[PDB]
Design a protein around this ligand. Structure first.
Ligand SMILES: N[C@@H](CC(=O)O)C(=O)O
Ligand SMILES: N[C@@H](CC(=O)O)C(=O)O
Ligand SMILES: N[C@@H](CC(=O)O)C(=O)O
Ligand SMILES: N[C@@H](CC(=O)O)C(=O)O
Ligand SMILES: [Zn+2]
Ligand SMILES: [Zn+2]
Ligand SMILES: [Zn+2]
Ligand SMILES: [Zn+2]
Ligand SMILES: [Zn+2]
Ligand SMILES: [Zn+2]
Ligand SMILES: [Zn+2]
Ligand SMILES: [Zn+2]
Lengths: 389, 389, 389, 389
């Protein structure tokens, strides 16, 4: 016998594949964590030491990419006890997440980019794929190297910058500050080969997207680099978002937000609005707090987001909204990889990474592969974080 | 015998001299790298140990001054592989260039002024004349001493500052920032005895020269110190440039730009426009990248500029545009030396530096003298950079 | 027809394999840039779309790891005209180099770690494997993030720090300074998963290795993290190096140094002195200058190192010294990978990266694979750096 | 009539020339500020538009290099009223000084290197040759760019660094501090093409040269880069200076110090001690104060140094000591140019700069040429600084 085990040959057989594109019943061959073949009827013997998997009667689709996650924990709006814990690997995989983008939020005093960066690396080490955004709510941005432009250019895992606008928790940034920060991210991205995006956490202020427009008049950053998130938090806001996307911008809907615009609802409206799913993304905001402010900007209620709403959103869309499974997945798969330029992610194509989900026809997660590795079986993590308990 | 070789007496005989002014058939005597005499019929014996050169049937003219060169290399817009290599001496001389001004571009993270400065000095050491601009696209400027005003005042080779406006790769500078930076360069120039110019890399933004005008309203810097470059990159832009020059400004046309306004074309239009050649300069942008952005600010194509377009431009002008050789040379000779106040350069006058070109009547380079030294013979570098291979 | 091309299946058939360990005539199967199987007689049909290569008659071995190259150039010891040029991809590959460690030297004023960092990524992007050392001759170290520890911990390509001792070009560091730096490097390595080494450039001072010894008594940094290079520069130095390795240290021999101790000669004595090859490495110092200094510390002669000395050394060892091919390889392969912990490098094993050299039985390089990609064919690069001409 | 005036042809006829080497009665031909020929009997008609000068009866020699002047003023040791005034051009020239090295002293609070730097350029601009030393008594050094190494490497006029030891006015530097600084200077010189020296101001402390020796053992800086000045300030000091030169060091004698060892007397003993004149220099310390301190370190008397002591010393040497004129000159010429590597200075050779002194046979200065320009006529300056009155 000759040993060919180093290749990790895996053949996933008989599933109804959504690439996301519906490819009907198709096969997928994997080696060294990469998809090396996609076709109907692949020879179970085509390669030595192959692990064959019968997925007949099952759905096969790309892993989710969650671009809004408080990896190291977040919160703190109601003081120190409200600091949320760090994210555990198993909570992501089990939710279908195989690629994630970490960021900071309100607190950047007890929360640091260097911490966020080490955690990002831990996750890659443990099997999934992770990147981060530098900055936080605070503007100017608190960086690792002292320059937003520098952080994006030279820190491998940094792909852009985060900020807070139209929020009672913002730093009251002016347009110069915003423009310069976005322009730096843009430039850093070209030098480092990163998307160089600027993510705007939106609050409830009446000004809504104004600041974005102003920015656009005060710089030459492409609209394709600006990403407003939580767009469903309020009506008027959601509405402007739709125009923004119509003008070519992309928009990020938060699945952990149920009122006033539900996630599935929002997506559907965007389409009806004539916006292409490619310019619509869905993110969780997992591990952040769900702070609720009153009339006088006083906190009242505070909770913590999880990742289940992701799948739930997809299910809904299909179930109650006439969406095709294909269509329903885009906002968590190719639209994201497409916006962030995540090479090798969000699509099942030869040459892409083996980040795959195995589900039941009714859309329930059964298996999860990360870079070709089995992470979840029977809806249960079989691979956990070094200290997961 | 007495040895008078230290003087390096050279007598260039019988050429049709363009000073650039047409001086018909005239002689040029050189000593210690300086032009010591210009007259018809100089006695081949007037001085001991004289090297006599018969240039009969040939054209003699001043060396080009290229004020836009990425000496240390540039690029990087499409990531690290796109970083261009440093400039080799021979590539300049062979192209007729004897004086050059180095600068930085988009990247000032992997690119540094101290590097640019050491390279500048190397070139002077090897025989040609070189200066640099401090700063880069980024505003505020990244300097050597920490102050634009300081760099221009105290670093001998620095003659001004560079910046990027109306470009999707700019740093989103505001007017205060621009004004202050130009005002600093202005002041530093008076203290250090430098032109103290401010060079503006122009992009494709609709705002075009606006920022310049605004600046002008927000400071008392003389229009003669502001230099917009790449003016031929787009029509509307080119058009505003013409008014700008009409208002007394000088403009820099980029020879490496063929569309939408060709170099020769631009020059011709400026004249027809009633602008004096003295306020029109031509620069190469050699060794920089030729990045091409799409609709959404996405790169598509990327190349690297060389120096041949310089001469080619001159040839064209004469050839296809009814320009006099004299006139055709100005934009690469006296207009430049005149704008930057390069003393001893751009004109063949007693007391000036022996920076001369020998060409065929059809305008082809045969010989090149830098500070009286033979650098190119028969269109071939006979003097190369320390590591040129 | 099913496409399986994504896999990059390549089978290297019937060469005499030195892993470096002599494996006699053995086959090598590659996929995705990985070595997936090594064994005698592999079925050319074992995998689809395979590219079969007949190496019968030839030698196959691991690609070289050169841990001492001035990637972006060096020199400057005699003025700006002496700054050497960056390294070209093809230069490396053609010399059998598939893995490299970039560093800085004397000049850390016109040279910057950020530049080095970028160049290193470009090389990875182009096809080979590259890392770097932070710091330079100067002590205290000039870093990217402002701290040696921080640089080693957080910048992905940084594996340790560089410095100079016992040289008329040193910073006159004291012991505290040395110790701290190495400590920092040590610790950053733990945090970042890097070797955390400290490389000492050795000069021609009489104090020789003292500083390393003192250091040892002034800190708890393992002797296994300390690397003295250019050991062959002088006799008395060479000799202490020997004892140093004897104490468990590892020494680095410079192949570009002929006198007094030539490379092959240095390795022979190591062995004679009873030193295990594992503790002996060979590196080029390619692209650095060859500055020769007088009695009064005055430069005289200055040259520029290449990579041919590496293969040359191997040849000589085998040819004039009676070293086994296997043993001759070690210092450029397993030994290096061994010291730097370059996982997946230095040996031909399943799971390892497909960095392979194909040579004639007379030790001539014919082909070169970097991460399984054909880089050199018939002793010539079919893969060039973006700007090679 | 052809104009050849640009050349500045001047022929110095029939003087007894000391290059300093006795060349007997020899002619000197100048052009462009350069010495183009030296020989007996040069044809007054050898070159056009020549200015012929009859030096028959006179002595011609090289202009003095004073490497120790407080160009911008000094003093301050007894309050602000004691700050001396800047140096006036004419003051220098009249004293035979054509080349100068400016520096700072005790006070580095009201005095700045930037000021010094500017003053140095003004002098070059006005007609002579000037350089400076960075630092001052204070250690660590107060620099322009923030680093000694950086200043020596990148500021064109900076040739090294200054400091003070064994003085009640010192900064109490320790050895590390000293060593580092000199190292820095050393290295910056290599990079910038400068001598890279370190000049030690000697005080009247009993420790005398110790610090220099310690230093020597704590670094690899060549003894040839270290200059102790004011050696004649005290006996015991003088005496170690002697051995110091004996070891290969070069010592600097202050002409403005009469007791205990007078200048001429210091030079005589050097020679007596068998020291080669090449290792002995003379400098004025012009414009510095003459602060006399008590027993309790209290100031008593305070005065201001001039430049007449230089010529005076020469005179005395010849006149009361039996030194050859030739030998008497050395310490102010070839020796200095020699130590500082002032190319084109200190000797009368073709190719050298035309910095010449014309004296009476009794050693009286009549004329002075700086870079071939007549600066002094009939012992008086016909060329004055911009603000002299
Ligand atoms: N509340 C979140 C911030 C956000 O969700 O925008 C946090 O943890 O900082
Ligand atoms: N693309 C150029 C910048 C410019 O040409 O404006 C560079 O090399 O940075
Ligand atoms: N001469 C080399 C230094 C060395 O080999 O460390 C350089 O480029 O700096
Ligand atoms: N007294 C002088 C100092 C010295 O001579 O070094 C001064 O002006 O500071
Ligand atoms: Zn938010
Ligand atoms: Zn959030
Ligand atoms: Zn530009
Ligand atoms: Zn440019
Ligand atoms: Zn070295
Ligand atoms: Zn080296
Ligand atoms: Zn002193
Ligand atoms: Zn003094």
């Amino acid at each position: 016998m000759i040993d060919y085990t180093a290749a990790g040959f895996t053949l996933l057989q008989g599933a109804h594949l959504y690439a996301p594109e519906d490819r009907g019943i198709c096969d997928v061959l994997v080696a060294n964590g990469k998809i090396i073949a996609v076709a109907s009827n692949i020879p179970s013997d085509i390669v030595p030491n192959c692990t064959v998997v019968d997925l007949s009667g099952q759905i096969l689709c790309p892993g989710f990419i969650d671009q809004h996650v408080h990896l190291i924990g977040g919160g703190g709006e109601a003081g120190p006890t409200t600091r949320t814990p760090e994210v555990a690997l198993s909570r992501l995989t089990e939710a279908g997440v195989t690629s994630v983008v970490g960021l900071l939020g309100t607190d950047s005093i007890s929360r640091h980019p260097e911490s966020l960066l080490a955690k990002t690396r831990a996750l890659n080490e443990e099997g999934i794929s992770a990147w981060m955004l530098t900055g936080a709510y605070h503007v100017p941005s608190r960086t690792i190297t002292g320059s937003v432009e520098k952080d994006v250019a030279i820190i491998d895992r940094v792909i852009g910058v985060k900020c807070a606008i139209s929020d009672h928790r913002s730093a009251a940034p002016d347009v110069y500050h915003l423009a310069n920060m976005a322009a730096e991210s843009r430039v850093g991205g070209l030098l480092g080969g990163k998307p160089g995006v600027t993510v705007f956490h939106m609050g409830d202020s009446k000004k809504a997207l104004q600041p974005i427009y102003d920015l656009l008049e005060n710089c030459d950053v492409p609209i394709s680099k600006l990403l407003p998130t939580h767009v469903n938090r309020n009506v008027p806001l959601f509405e402007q978002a739709l125009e923004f996307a119509r003008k070519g911008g992309t928009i990020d809907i938060t699945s952990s937000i149920d009122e006033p615009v539900a996630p599935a609802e929002g997506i559907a409206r965007a389409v009806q609005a004539g916006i292409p799913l490619a310019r619509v993304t869905l993110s969780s905001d997992g591990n952040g707090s769900q702070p609720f402010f009153d009339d006088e900007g006083n906190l009242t209620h505070i909770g913590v987001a999880g990742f289940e709403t992701l799948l739930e959103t997809v299910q809904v869309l299909v179930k109650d909204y006439d969406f095709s499974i294909s269509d329903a997945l885009r906002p968590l798969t190719s639209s994201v990889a497409g916006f962030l330029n995540l090479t090798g992610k969000g699509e099942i194509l030869p040459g892409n990474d083996a980040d795959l989900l195995v589900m039941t026809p009714e859309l329930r997660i059964e298996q999860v592969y990360a870079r070709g590795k089995l992470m979840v079986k029977d809806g249960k993590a079989c691979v956990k974080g070094t200290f997961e308990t």
